[PDB]
Write a protein that binds this ligand. Structure first.
Ligand SMILES: CC(C)CCn1cc2cc(Nc3cc(=O)n(Cc4ncn(C)n4)c(=O)n3Cc3cc(F)c(F)cc3F)c(Cl)cc2n1
Ligand SMILES: CC(C)CCn1cc2cc(Nc3cc(=O)n(Cc4ncn(C)n4)c(=O)n3Cc3cc(F)c(F)cc3F)c(Cl)cc2n1
Lengths: 301, 301
């Protein structure tokens, strides 16, 4: 009842955020058990940032070059290593607030909560999707580097994103917690364009079903379509393909509303071809693609 | 595009959420120091909910009738009283997770973060605004009663909202933490309609400032207006009149952009009278009214 972008409660992640400093370079780190994870960019001086050789830079550091602060408490670094684009600092104290967790790599279209932090202090939380072009449309200022994205299932935090940089278009790029970038980006201060982005079809459909559950129904029609014919139109409008697995995941929303998946596809097809002609859906003038089927079911049921 | 609804980190509030049960009637409570605050509706049986005599129902209760639980841990109630529409249950344990806090009563237009909870268990966090008709366009399912809204300013949590009920239109009504309703609503299970809503002028102005900051300024014109003349026009388009306080909270955005508040008012006045004429602001044909001047500075700066 009502429909908004809803994040996971952030408390389990807040207790893990720390500040990491190397020289004067500073950013956010994630403290789990006796390891702090942060972007390896922190080992760069100003001059290093443009074109770093990270293996070279790291070999020139020792443990005592790293200042880790949890609030006003300094954590002594007793080991360091690098895993792809993520620096791992072993410290001499276990974080008592460490939740149950895993590191996962998400797929385009999947959503997650971001805890934006500055100087190791959490500032805000919101929901994001990994775009098909592997950027995120985040809300991040200077100093947000190392902020994390996550999902919570029961008591377990699945970390899926660590923030590195803003691109010239104002979208954002980062890695998983194993230090591999999402997308064709590199951890260097040079201008980087992303590939052309597409709309997340299965998510638009999920959001149309949310609209129906909340009584907003003007866009339904009685056409139907084959999956293939819908996919031909979607592709033409820079929408991702809809797979049979996607059709399957929409099953519960289809059953709840009595609207067959391919009928909702026919509705979306007409929205693409005819536009919304000044009308809104769930208060939006645009087709929203950053709610997954799971997101809709959790917020509606 | 650019701005999104961002919530405060919810951890400081998560540690205060409990469950309160009286018979089978169950909802969420807020545990601060040695007091649990919750909606007094919890003392209603099914047959009471339509037209409760709360003084009568409470006289029949003792401390022993209240089950307060932090997860599955019972907190023993040692005192009880009622202040307006909130029940205050004194318990024998001071919450060690109590943050620095205060209770505040907000005005229409002001935004806050909501921590939606079910059975004392946080489920999600999102931002929303108090509408001029004293409702909120929340996202709440059955069992959300007693969920709270808040702002965090320098490690102090300002609690501003406790959720009570959904109205027939799907919008939401509740009290401050002293148990006084926002708007003309009462805590009984009868259809109550909200008064006709209006657009939050001070927030639309904040959003025009946001647009200017980001270089989108086609709508600035060569005119000005008095506040009174503006207010008279605004009401003709179902926009809220501005208060002196509203003028004052636009001060920082005015200073940052060099655009006088009354000049921006004259700009909005022309938009109201003449329409958008095909143009967009921050990528949208709709003027956003749920971002406060404070929200804009937070996200821009
Ligand atoms: C005395 C100290 C206070 C100050 C010293 N100092 C200056 C610093 C500058 C830094 N650079 C960045 C910080 C930052 O928060 N974001 C995120 C962001 N998001 C939205 N915006 C608008 N910015 C970045 O994009 N960059 C650039 C950047 C990061 C990379 F990881 C990468 F690989 C390449 C890159 F170009 C960092 Cl990481 C540490 C610093 N320390
Ligand atoms: C699980 C059961 C076995 C246990 C029994 N039980 C049945 C209950 C029913 C209850 N009533 C409500 C719960 C609830 O979450 N929301 C919020 C909401 N938001 C969006 N939706 C869709 N619902 C409500 O609006 N009401 C109605 C309501 C609340 C008031 F405080 C008020 F003053 C008047 C009112 F009509 C409560 Cl409070 C406790 C109960 N316990």
């Amino acid at each position: 009842s009502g429909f908004r972008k809803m994040a996971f409660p952030s408390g389990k992640v807040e207790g893990c955020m720390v500040q990491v400093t190397c020289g004067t370079t500073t950013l956010n780190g994630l403290w789990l058990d006796d390891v702090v994870y942060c972007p390896r960019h922190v080992i760069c001086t100003s001059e290093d940032m443009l074109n770093p050789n990270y293996e070279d830079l790291l070999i020139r550091k020792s443990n005592h070059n790293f200042l880790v602060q949890a609030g006003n408490v300094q954590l002594r670094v007793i080991g360091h290593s690098m895993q792809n684009c993520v620096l791992k600092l072993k410290v001499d104290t276990a974080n008592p607030k460490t939740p149950k967790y895993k590191f996962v790599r998400i797929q385009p279209g999947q959503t997650f909560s971001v805890l934006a932090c500055y100087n190791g202090s959490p500032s805000g939380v919101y929901q994001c999707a990994m775009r098909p072009n592997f950027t995120i449309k985040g809300s991040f200022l200077n100093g947000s580097c190392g902020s994390v994205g996550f999902n919570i299932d029961y008591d377990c935090v699945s970390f899926c994103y660590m923030h590195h940089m803003e691109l010239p278009t104002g979208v954002h790029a980062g890695t998983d917690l194993e230090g591999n970038f999402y997308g064709p980006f590199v951890d260097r201060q040079t201008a980087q364009a992303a590939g052309t982005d597409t709309t997340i079809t299965v998510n638009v459909l999920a959001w149309l079903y949310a609209a129906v559950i909340n009584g907003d129904r003007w866009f339904l029609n009685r056409f139907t379509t084959t999956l293939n014919d819908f996919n031909l139109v979607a592709m033409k409008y820079n929408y991702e393909p809809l797979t049979q697995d996607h059709v399957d995941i929409l099953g519960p929303l289809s059953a709840q509303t009595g609207i067959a998946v391919l009928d909702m596809c026919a509705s979306l097809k007409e929205l693409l071809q005819n536009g919304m002609n000044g009308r809104t859906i769930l208060g939006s003038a645009l087709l929203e693609d950053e709610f997954t089927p799971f997101d809709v079911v959790r917020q509606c049921s």
